[PDB]
Design a protein around this ligand. Sequence first.
Ligand SMILES: [Mg+2]
Ligand SMILES: [Mg+2]
Ligand SMILES: [Mg+2]
Ligand SMILES: [Mg+2]
Ligand SMILES: [Mg+2]
Length: 49
Amino acid sequence: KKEDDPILIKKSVIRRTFKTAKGKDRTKCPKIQRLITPERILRKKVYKA
RNA sequence: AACCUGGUUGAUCCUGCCAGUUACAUAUGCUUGUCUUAAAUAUUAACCCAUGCAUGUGCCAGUUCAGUAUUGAACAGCGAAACU
Ligand SMILES: [Mg+2]
Ligand SMILES: [Mg+2]
Ligand SMILES: [Mg+2]
Ligand SMILES: [Mg+2]
Ligand SMILES: [Mg+2]
């Protein structure tokens, strides 16, 4: 849902899991762009200031 | 260094050039031992060109699910590619 909490977006992002050519075991995650974080809102407040 | 000398006649004083002398550029011939500098395919053909190189660029501050590393379970170090 749109009304939904950002942390629900955080928890639902896909994980990638894979085996390195070296034979190692690793897991990679994407970063969320557009995400509403405290930092965005702070910057906004400061500009209006 | 504000200087001139040789050549017309049988001899002479003139005009006048030629020639010498001087510097400086290219060129060249012979000859070349140190040290300090150092121009350099302008002139002829803005003629023709094999090959190599002479224009690239990343920070903490645009984009990383590359990779690496057993990394704050959204990423967070290092760091391609590729957008910008
Ligand atoms: Mg006469
Ligand atoms: Mg005579
Ligand atoms: Mg003369
Ligand atoms: Mg010596
Ligand atoms: Mg690059």
